[PDB]
Amino acid sequence: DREAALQERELAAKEVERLRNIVRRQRKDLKA
Amino acid sequence: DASLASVLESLEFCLRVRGSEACVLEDLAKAIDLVHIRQDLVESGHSLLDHAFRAQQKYERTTNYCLDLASEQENTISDQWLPELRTAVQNAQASSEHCK
Amino acid sequence: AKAQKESNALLDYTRKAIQRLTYLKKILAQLEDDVVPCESQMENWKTNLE
Amino acid sequence: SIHSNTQAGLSTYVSAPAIIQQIVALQSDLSSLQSDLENSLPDDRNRCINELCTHIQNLQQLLFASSTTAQPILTPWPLMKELDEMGKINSKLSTAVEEVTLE
Amino acid sequence: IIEEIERDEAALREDLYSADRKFAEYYNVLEQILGVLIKLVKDLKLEHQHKYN
Amino acid sequence: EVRDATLAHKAEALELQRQLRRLQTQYDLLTGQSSALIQGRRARVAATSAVS
Amino acid sequence: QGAAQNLPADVNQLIDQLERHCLAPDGSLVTKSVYSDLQLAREEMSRERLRYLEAMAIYCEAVAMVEEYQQAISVANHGGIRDVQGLYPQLGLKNSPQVYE
């Protein structure tokens, strides 16, 4: 199950990069 | 006061839009019930920079005492094996002496 | 995400200890099995002293 | 700022006279962990967990070889015959040494 | 407000605790390595080979 | 092992998942939430230039 | 090094737990009085903001009723485009205010 867990781990980890900068760009500009 | 409250967390830009108009929500009677359980648990929440060290110091250093230290009493003596060979190969030639 | 998610990405190897350090249970055990032969050289050899 | 006790017991009656000190005071507090921890967790978990990451795999197979084959091997891999055969004659046949004296 | 205020809290509250629950799952496997005699099998591993090695 | 790591990584995914939709909705709902009261200005200002 | 990592969390936890018990003293109620005041706004809403949400009924257009007569002649001066429509909105549509005046 490690290989099955490995393929879903990277997708569960790749989201962090796409869930920081867009948040760093939106919630900052949801204040104007 | 109204502007500086919202712009209070410019450096803490994560808390800035969060701390723009928070108390208008009357969450200072509600969210304060949650900041308390947050902050007494900073010993875990923020402290995960040390929890890995706690994972290291409290127990993984012991695993190193289990694993690394199992060689620390022999790593410097690994060079002593060369003269210790002369004590051991001298037994090896004792096997060779009785060959004839 | 910059506090724990970067650490949790690194912490996955600590999660992998449930295969590695569970094997360390064996490491802490199969070497513990060697203690009985190793206990002989002093505890059984304390009698050998006389 | 809950780490301080008067963090809320002083803010209001100092803001009215001085509306610069307290607003940045809470900013400094909350930011005492955003850059010291939240922006510094990425730096320090590549040194602490890095040791955790390297060791845990090392502890299992390689440092395992550097542990299980260290205290009975690293110094003693040629001293196993000086461990067991030493116990064969001077510990097992130890009582058998008295046999020549006894008979 | 009731669900979100906690959710806004739980946004930063239990997410920093997400690793914490996983540290415990690593702390046990850190300790369960012959947990019944961990202290004796950590200072010496081999309780007697370190005594003679 | 990675199955245990998935929990550390699903939390690394799920916890940050329900917040982008929040912001995306915010970027599509908060742009007009504040403007939903400015339109009342005309009704409140017409007679201000009358009694004075 | 590890103990230094926990220090920012360690210094926090020293008073963080007690600040729940410190909430009742003045160390927090100078701002956090709302909790001791039980939503210091008005104890949520029972009647107070009702008195002003009932004003949305009135100050929005039902108060536009009386001032619409003044606008009709005021529009007649500078807003010549709506001068013709001033009578319909005020003297005809808002004519019901004449009793209410």
- Residue D80 per-residue DSSP state: S
Task: Measure the CA–CA gap between E39 and C2, rounded to whole angstroms.
Answer: 36
Task: Pull the structure tokens for residue B89.
Answer: 């190969």
Cross-chain CB nearest to D56 (options C7, C20, C40): C20
Dihedral-angle region of residue D34 (phi above 0 means left; psi in -120 to 50 means alpha; beta otherwise): alpha
Task: Measure the CA–CA gap between D32 and D14, rounded to whole angstroms.
Answer: 21
Helix axes B32-39, G2-16, angle to 10 degrees: 140
Chains contacting A with at least 3 CB pairs below 8 Å? B, C, F
Q: Give the residue from chain E lying closest to D49, CA to CA.
A: E23
Contacts of E19 (CB under 8 A, 6+ apart): B48, B51, C4, C7, C8, C11, F8, F11
Residues of F near E (Cβ–Cβ under 8 Å) read: 4, 7-8, 11-12, 15-16, 19
Q: How far is F16 from chain C (nearest CA, A)?
A: 8
Chain A hits for B16, CB-CB cut-off 8 Å, are 28, 31
Written as one letter, the residue type at E49 is Q
- Is there an interface between E and C (3+ Cβ pairs < 8 A)? yes
**DSSP class per residue in B39-69:** HTTTTTTTTHHHHHHHIIIIIIHHHHHHTTH
Residue B77 CB burial class (10 angstroms; 0-12, 13-18, ≥19): middle
Residues of G near F (Cβ–Cβ under 8 Å) read: 59-61, 64, 67, 70-71, 74
| End-to-end Cα, chain G, rounded Å | 80
Contacts of D75 (CB under 8 A, 6+ apart): B73, B74, B77, B78, B80, B81, B84, E53
Number of residue pairs across B and D with CB atoms under 8 Å? Answer: 105
Cβ atoms of residues E22 and C16 within 8 Å: no
Task: Measure the CA–CA gap between C6 and C10, rounded to whole angstroms.
Answer: 6
Helix (H) or strand (E) holding E38: none
Radius of gyration of the CA atoms of chain G, in A: 29
B63 touches chain A (CB under 8 A): no
Task: Measure the CA–CA gap between D6 and D90, rounded to whole angstroms.
Answer: 75
Q: How far is D5 from chain G (nearest CA, A)?
A: 6
Helix (H) or strand (E) holding D100: helix D94-102
Determination approach: cryo-EM
Task: Measure the CA–CA gap between G67 and F45, rounded to whole angstroms.
Answer: 11
Cross-chain CB nearest to F47 (options G60, G61, G67): G67
Contacts of D43 (CB under 8 A, 6+ apart): none
Identify the CA nearest to E12 among candidates G63, G17, B31. B31
Q: What are phi and psi of G48, to 5 degrees?
A: -70, -60
Most distant CA pair in chain A, distance? 48
Cross-chain CB nearest to A13 (options C2, C9, C19): C9
Q: How many CB atoms lie within 10 A of CB B44?
A: 20
Cross-chain CB nearest to B28 (options G13, G16, G35): G35
Q: In the block, which residue shows the tokens 């490995």?
A: A6
- Is there an interface between G and C (3+ Cβ pairs < 8 A)? no
Cβ atoms of residues E30 and C27 within 8 Å: no
Q: How many CB atoms lie within 10 A of CB D21?
A: 11
Dihedral-angle region of residue G43 (phi above 0 means left; psi in -120 to 50 means alpha; beta otherwise): left
Q: In the block, which residue shows the tokens 């921890």?
A: D37
Interface test with C, best of D33, D50, D56 (most C CBs within 10 A): D56
Resolution in A: 8.1
Task: Pull the structure tokens for residue B16.
Answer: 């800035």
Q: In the block, which residue shows the tokens 């019930």?
A: B33
Task: Pull the structure tokens for residue B49.
Answer: 């920079």
- Residue E44 per-residue DSSP state: S
Q: In the block, which residue shows the tokens 């012991």?
A: B62
Task: Measure the CA–CA gap between E45 and E33, rounded to whole angstroms.
Answer: 11
Dihedral-angle region of residue B26 (phi above 0 means left; psi in -120 to 50 means alpha; beta otherwise): left
Cross-chain CB nearest to B74 (options D19, D56, D74): D74
Helix-strand-coil split of chain D, %, nearest 5: 60, 0, 40
Residue D101 CB burial class (10 angstroms; 0-12, 13-18, ≥19): exposed
Task: Measure the CA–CA gap between D17 and D32, rounded to whole angstroms.
Answer: 25
- Is there an interface between B and G (3+ Cβ pairs < 8 A)? yes
Contacts of G33 (CB under 8 A, 6+ apart): G40
Chain B hits for D34, CB-CB cut-off 8 Å, are 11-12, 14
